[PDB]
Amino acid sequence: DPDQICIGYHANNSTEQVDTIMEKNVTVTHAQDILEKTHNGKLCDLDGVKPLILRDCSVAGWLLGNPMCDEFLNVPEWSYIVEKINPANDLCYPGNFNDYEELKHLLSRINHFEKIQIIPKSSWSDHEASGVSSACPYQGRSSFFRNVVWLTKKDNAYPTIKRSYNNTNQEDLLVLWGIHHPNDAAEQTRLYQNPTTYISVGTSTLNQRLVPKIATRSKVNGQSGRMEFFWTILKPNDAINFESNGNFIAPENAYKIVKKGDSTIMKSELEYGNCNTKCQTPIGAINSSMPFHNIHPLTIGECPKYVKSSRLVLATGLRNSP
Amino acid sequence: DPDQICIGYHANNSTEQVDTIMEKNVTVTHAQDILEKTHNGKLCDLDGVKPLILRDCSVAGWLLGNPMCDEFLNVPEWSYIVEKINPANDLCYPGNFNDYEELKHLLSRINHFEKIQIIPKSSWSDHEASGVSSACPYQGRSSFFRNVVWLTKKDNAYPTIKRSYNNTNQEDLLVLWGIHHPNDAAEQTRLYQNPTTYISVGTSTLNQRLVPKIATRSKVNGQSGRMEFFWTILKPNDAINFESNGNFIAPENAYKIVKKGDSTIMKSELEYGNCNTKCQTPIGAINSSMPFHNIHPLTIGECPKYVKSSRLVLATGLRNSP
Amino acid sequence: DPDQICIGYHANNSTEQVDTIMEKNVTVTHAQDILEKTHNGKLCDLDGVKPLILRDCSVAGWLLGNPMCDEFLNVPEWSYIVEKINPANDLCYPGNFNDYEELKHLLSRINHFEKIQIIPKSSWSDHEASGVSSACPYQGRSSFFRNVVWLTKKDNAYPTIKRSYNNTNQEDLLVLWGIHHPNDAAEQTRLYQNPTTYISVGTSTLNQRLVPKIATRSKVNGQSGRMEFFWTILKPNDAINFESNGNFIAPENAYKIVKKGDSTIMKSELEYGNCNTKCQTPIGAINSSMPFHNIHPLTIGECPKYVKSSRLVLATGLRNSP
Amino acid sequence: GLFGAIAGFIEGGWQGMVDGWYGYHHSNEQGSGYAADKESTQKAIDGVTNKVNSIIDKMNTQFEAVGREFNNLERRIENLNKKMEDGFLDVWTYNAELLVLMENERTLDFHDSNVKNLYDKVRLQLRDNAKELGNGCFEFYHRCDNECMESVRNGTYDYPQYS
Amino acid sequence: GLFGAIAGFIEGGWQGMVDGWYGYHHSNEQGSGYAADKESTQKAIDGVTNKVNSIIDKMNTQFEAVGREFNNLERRIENLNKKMEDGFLDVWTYNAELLVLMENERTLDFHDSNVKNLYDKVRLQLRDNAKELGNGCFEFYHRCDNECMESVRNGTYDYPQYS
Amino acid sequence: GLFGAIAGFIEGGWQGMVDGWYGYHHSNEQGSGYAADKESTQKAIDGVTNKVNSIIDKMNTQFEAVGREFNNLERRIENLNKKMEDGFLDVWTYNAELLVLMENERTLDFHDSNVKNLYDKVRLQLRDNAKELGNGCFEFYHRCDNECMESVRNGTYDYPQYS
Ligand SMILES: *[C@@H]1O[C@H](CO)[C@@H](O)[C@H](O)[C@H]1NC(C)=O
Ligand SMILES: *[C@@H]1O[C@H](CO)[C@@H](O)[C@H](O)[C@H]1NC(C)=O
Ligand SMILES: *[C@@H]1O[C@H](CO)[C@@H](O)[C@H](O)[C@H]1NC(C)=O
Ligand SMILES: *[C@@H]1O[C@H](CO)[C@@H](O)[C@H](O)[C@H]1NC(C)=O
Ligand SMILES: *[C@@H]1O[C@H](CO)[C@@H](O)[C@H](O)[C@H]1NC(C)=O
Ligand SMILES: *[C@@H]1O[C@H](CO)[C@@H](O)[C@H](O)[C@H]1NC(C)=O
Ligand SMILES: *[C@@H]1O[C@H](CO)[C@@H](O)[C@H](O)[C@H]1NC(C)=O
Ligand SMILES: *[C@@H]1O[C@H](CO)[C@@H](O)[C@H](O)[C@H]1NC(C)=O
């Protein structure tokens, strides 16, 4: 009956809920989700730059030039690299890659190689520079790694090798080489005349002297021999010196490091998605203005911060009354 | 005189104190301690499974079969392993264990071995497979490690050894072997005819070629010789190939890895306690419903979270008035 | 004009501002800065103890006794060590120091060495113990490291060396020695008669057998030869045994570890400042009662806690009204 | 909540006030109606917008994990590396989840405070000229037209005029 | 504390109220007695029980240290490993100790708030029918029997009936 | 702020009160003057001093970085080591910057609370003996000399004497 004025506040049809310390599922008038929970399930270009998808090849298989990896003989620049968990085409001829994980850590800071020739096959006058094996088949015929040469005796002789390469490029240079470990003394002399051999390698910082280990080993890819590979970064104006009297898997090609920057090696079974993104993960790409996400901890690009939360929602409005 | 109603709150005889940011020792009506501060001082079974207490033996001494460790020749499955800080019975015959810490890291994921014979003493026709030393006494008489064999020349001859073991079990197999480093060329020929020797070992992933180092060294356990031991995991269907013409401490026994799971190697001077627990530490076991504790940072089992706090007490009630 | 009493609060001419979550630049009556933002720009004594400033020398150059580092031939005890990013005077004669970073980690726990003679030059009767090189010039004349000796053939002969040192001191003893890697077999015989050589080193825990690597290498300091150096800690009452028939860079001096404690190796281009401090950083020293600072994360002494904040200011007073 | 206004002495919220977060409901001879208080509504928008941005900006410099590889004889540092990356992710997840929980609570009590401060802004203007019913309303002794209601919302209610 | 009720205008607590955390003390011709307010007591129990559990549950995913061993030429990573495990333990010890300090403070002020909201629930029901003494009590002008006191605790006090 | 006193119903601060943080301004026949309330001023000094020290002491056990070196084939653990030290520094920088932001807010609202609790301490003593102007002042009906003002500040104001 008499006039009156009341003080009150907003309510609405909202069912959005938030949490506090003392209370859960508190309905509010307005809330803001700050957690991205979805991804496109694809490996995309990172800001217009396509990744390097190795498919069934490994970083080793790529860099040494396994004939199955001929696809990647001169790859264009990349944003990131995607390798499968257990790629089929690794070292076709069995054996290890020395300091492999430290090499892969270097790839994380590299976006583009430019492969060049540093020791041509034609310069091996006194040795046969055409060794092949059925462990590395290329179209049924026996073959070998493209970027290194298997030197063997010529005319029942293996004279001491003494070769230098001087890095007259402006860029750092990834050099790879190897040693062959045979089965027995028979195969040792049959391939390289000399029974007791060595390989010495020297740069300004490297001082190596490898000796082959002749031993009987379980067949891998139908081979009891092993090949152990090595690598180094050759600085501009420095030179690498090889000396050997047998078992030397010599370099043919090396890689100029022409572009450095942010990169990473993702392990993923996924294939190329034909999309573009600003943020990429191993299980998919993220397009989101949210400040947080929970997709995957390993990401590359302009990304939200990762949390393990299933839900992050901020109250912005009032407690909503029924 | 007139009627009245008052508003008040609870008080009681509580002397429990809590802290806030602005104020310390604030007496409250009710509080909850959330920090466990006591332990039973004993090494117990972990949820019904007894630990492996090595007493005065080391992991090396156990696995190689130091005669002082005959107690642990075939140990049942364990929940955790307890080793003293400096066990008396390690490598009785001096020398190192190669990649020892990495082997111990493997034990942290292992709950049970099953020891088996892989190369019987009886198969050493051309060599003496009964070498012993006073550095490894067993009841005053000279002896040696139980799980490996010290091969020496027979009839002033040490013919080249060529032995394979193929892991036809379903489980992974821990294989151990060793090389003997003598004092001088005299002892070299006296034990193994050949003056220049080697040991080569090969699996699908291993490619080793050890050469003994003859040199004069400080006496340890009355011995200037050293023995260096190695190990590997042999996968199912893979085989290990030994070749040697001297200095070879060959395998007799290997260990099948039959049970994998959570485990740990605790360093502790404590002995077995004959109790049971859900949570164990190196200085004692914890039986507690508290969410936190401050006993020791290294624990195994269903444990509270460790903090370095001396006191954690939550206020639940009102400020209590005197 | 009736009487009245009012309730109010303090205001003043303060312009000090603080921040809260909901509000920035909030003017208050009183605030407390808790972040130290300045330093003196100098390398000082740490609580009265002068640091070891290596100037243009490296830890290697110092310990081996590069002639350019004669300043540090017997340095007094230190509080910390200051090394430049790329010191000019390292290994004058080229080559590596083995396990160098692990040696430097030891220095972080050492405050004082006492250098002593363990093998005098006068004891080399059958060898020339006066080898020098123009790669290590001292006043224009060719010279060599002070604390090690370059042994060469005498009278066209290099008889096998067999020398022991027994650590009869009470302190641990840092021993250093080296092997020389020549260019070719010509230089090998010209310096040490024997063409095939070795160096064996043995303590109670060490069992080493080094073999020189003869190879052609890029000239460094006008030398294609390399020298590789090694080290060990010789416990009290233990002895080190050297045996070699060539290429042996033998010890002359060793270092008694007489004082252990807190120390660190700072990398800094700064020179000695002639001041004293309680807290030091690589870019300057801090004198401050603040609980936090943002100068540099690497500090030694009684220091405030480091944060990456540019500003930390606590409100203590009221919101100040204009 | 803490300040006793929202879901307290003011029993519920108003569906009809779509204009802002806090305000008034008048009624007189002319007609009734809702009108948001634009001062305290705007004050709250600013406060809450800033909170949100402060929460986002504080978590800028955060841990970012990186792929590393190890061979089968580097299991100790492989494991160390894993424990360290999970370590930091767990610390940051906790820092996010807790910040939200703590500030959600503060935000709701902040609204509660703003409503109570609005009630007290009216209460201190009226005094003996209106009866404090206690449900959030004030019963006028004198008549109050749309000019007179506007003065209460303005903060320009002349008490000496009506007593 | 912050809300001025506990150890404020209500000078002390009551030993005699064993029934709950907040309540009333009546006195009339019939007899005096204590009776806890079951609504705000239960509200607080729920709030505080949840706080406690939220503090326990937030610290579930926490760092767990592990034994690792290193040989005497692995002193750098041994030391690294030590620094990392102490690192995480120190971060989590701080997160626990601080959470408790911060929420203890909030809990005490929460009780203070609940007492003040109860005083205001009574104050707004009585108005002119009782004199606000200011020590936490209300002096009745009219007589109030046990039926009449029950109505105040219910929240069903009819003001028009007694004025 | 949260409690509505500072920059609320008390419109501004007093330049003239240099004695303490909160207090009174009296005026009577004798003379006017400012006098700080020493009880609530001292209470606040203690509370705020403790806060400051608690903030300093909580951060005692904190991460301290250390120089480590690696050669060019130890890039993985060099990098790991770097990520771990930046990691801890970033966690602690966040813990400091956030603690200050959170407690600054509490401190300002703490002052606001203390001023409001002082206003209510006077209000509850006077009651009908003075008129609540609503700007922070109380207009006396009876005359109040310097002995009578002192009683209000003491907390020993006899209400029955003046009504
Ligand atoms: C509210 O929280 C409960 C657990 O207390 C949960 O089970 C329920 O799904 C939540 N409400 C929703 C999703 O509407
Ligand atoms: C390699 O060639 C450059 C000139 O291109 C020369 O200056 C440099 O000395 C050479 N490097 C070595 C190691 O001989
Ligand atoms: C008061 O404390 C005594 C011990 O001093 C205890 O035994 C008693 O039960 C307490 N009173 C209660 C719970 O009402
Ligand atoms: C109470 O706190 C003080 C510091 O304020 C502390 O020294 C004391 O040990 C505490 N507990 C007591 C006296 O039981
Ligand atoms: C071990 O035995 C299996 C099956 O009996 C055989 O296939 C395998 O090749 C053997 N392994 C080696 C390394 O010879
Ligand atoms: C504020 O007042 C103080 C007097 O204590 C004076 O020293 C200071 O200069 C004044 N500040 C300004 C900006 O006038
Ligand atoms: C006040 O803060 C603003 C950002 O909120 C900043 O730009 C400014 O530099 C600060 N200091 C001033 C204006 O002195
Ligand atoms: C070194 O000297 C001590 C003192 O005579 C002797 O007892 C010890 O055997 C020696 N050490 C070695 C390794 O021979």
Residue numbers in the entry:
A (entry chain E), B (entry chain A), C (entry chain C): -1 to 320
D (entry chain F), E (entry chain B), F (entry chain D): 1 to 163
Pull text from the paper:
We have carried out structural studies on the HAs of a number of H5 mutants that were isolated from infected humans in Vietnam and Egypt to explain differences in their receptor binding properties. None of the substituted residues in the mutants we have characterised make direct interactions with the receptors; they appear to have their effects by perturbing the biochemical properties of the receptor binding pocket.
tyTy H5 is the prototype of clade 2.2 viruses that are now established in Egypt. Three mutations, a deletion of residue 133 (Δ133), and two amino acid substitutions, Ile155Thr and Ser125Asn were originally identified as Egyptian strain specific mutations. Interestingly, when Δ133 and Ile155Thr were introduced simultaneously into tyTy H5, a small increase in avian receptor binding (~3-fold) and a significant increase of human receptor binding (~100-fold) were observed. Crystallographic analysis of the double mutant reveals that the structure of the sialic acid binding pocket, near residue 133, changes significantly compared to the structure of wild-type tyTy HA. Secondly, because of the Ile155Thr substitution, the hydrophobic surface, formed jointly by the side-chain of Ile-155 and the protruding Ala-133 in wild-type HA, is lost. In this regard, our binding and structural data suggest that the Δ133/Ile155Thr mutant is a plausible intermediate since it has the ability to bind avian receptors tightly while at the same time displaying enhanced affinity for human receptor. Indeed surveillance data show that H5 viruses with HAs containing the Δ133/Ile155Thr mutations have been isolated from both poultry and humans in Egypt.
